[PDB]
Amino acid sequence: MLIAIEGVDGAGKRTLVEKLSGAFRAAGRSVATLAFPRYGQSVAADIAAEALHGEHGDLASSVYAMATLFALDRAGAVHTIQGLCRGYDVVILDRYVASNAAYSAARLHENAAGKAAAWVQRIEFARLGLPKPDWQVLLAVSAEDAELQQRTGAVYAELAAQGWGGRWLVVGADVDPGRLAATLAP
């Protein structure tokens, strides 16, 4: 089973990934995890992070440019992801493809039915062949540009409400991991 944990920065995603891992293992299930972006391993990731800090000219001015780099990062790990899905009962990703839909849409003042979010699907799932997650779990918290961060949180909620790329659950900071693991299990 492939699960992606999503949300804005400071939502506490990694804490949830770890809480979920423990719960799945307590339930008898093997777990492996990966985090995106793969800063330090992916040149595309690194150039993207670097662009957001003003390097690489006018690169960061293009939403689709940044989205492409982050996509290329994930596409590089496609064989790793498919390997974990064979080796383990549950693979949890700290960020996945929906990060690209939410952050790009938000920046472009588009909604989840908009062009960018659709493009992301065409590019990452169809073209680049990234597997669709069985579940995407949005961690939605009150407080993690802040208007952009809150707009991203909202668009996330909209991907969840529309079942973008598959089934979602939306959860809070205090969700019970044992109960969440039971809901996610096949």
Ligand X SMILES: CCc1cc2[nH]c(=O)c(C#N)c(-c3ccc(NS(C)(=O)=O)cc3)c2c(C)n1
Question: Which residues of the shown chain bind ligand X in the complex (CB under 6 A)?
Answer: 9, 36-37, 63, 66-67, 70, 95, 99-100, 103-104, 107
Residue 156 interface partner, choices ligand X, Na ion, none, CB cut-off 5-8 Å depending on type = none
Site for Na ion in 100-129 (CB under 5 A): 108-109
**Residue that has been written with the tokens 């979920």 in this structure:** 20
Three-state DSSP state, 4: strand
Q: Would you give the end-to-end CA distance of the chain in angstroms?
A: 8
Residue 164: CB minimum distance to ligand X, A: 14
Ranges of H-type helices in 34-110: 43-52, 63-76, 78-87, 97-108
Residue 108 interface partner, choices ligand X, Na ion, none, CB cut-off 5-8 Å depending on type = Na ion
Q: Which is nearer to ligand X, 66 or 155 (CB)?
A: 66
Residue 68 interface partner, choices Na ion, ligand X, none, CB cut-off 5-8 Å depending on type = none
φ, ψ (nearest 5 deg) of residue 62: -100, 115
Planar angle of CA 98, 100, 106, nearest 5 degrees: 100
The answer to whether 33 and 54 have CB atoms below 8 angstroms apart is no
Residue 118: CB minimum distance to ligand X, A: 15
Q: Which is nearer to ligand X, 104 or 121 (CB)?
A: 104
CA 109, distance to chain mean position in Å, is: 19
Q: Which is nearer to ligand X, 21 or 38 (CB)?
A: 38
Structure token digits, residue 20: 């979920």
Number of residues that bind Na ion (CB under 5 A): 2
**CB atoms near residue 106 (< 10 Å):** 24
| Eight-state DSSP code of residue 130 | P
**Residue that has been written with the tokens 């693979």 in this structure:** 91
Q: Which is nearer to ligand X, 33 or 100 (CB)?
A: 100
Order across the sheet with 167-171: list the strands. 31-35, 90-94, 2-6, 135-139, 167-171
Residue 63 interface partner, choices ligand X, Na ion, none, CB cut-off 5-8 Å depending on type = ligand X
Residue 116: CB minimum distance to ligand X, A: 9
Residue 67: CB minimum distance to ligand X, A: 5
Residue 109 interface partner, choices Na ion, ligand X, none, CB cut-off 5-8 Å depending on type = Na ion
Give me the residues that bind Na ion (CB under 5 A), please. Answer: 108-109
